[PDB]
């Protein structure tokens, strides 16, 4: 999901 690095990390909401 977002544990590695999709666009999630940029905002760092979920980050997994």
């Amino acid at each position: 999901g977002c544990c590695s690095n999709p666009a999630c990390i940029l905002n760092n909401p979920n980050q997994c």
Side-chain angles (χ1 to χ4, degrees):
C2 294
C3 222
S4 187
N5 164 261
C8 285
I9 326 302
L10 184 61
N11 293 328
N12 201 326
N14 179 33
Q15 219 293 264
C16 200

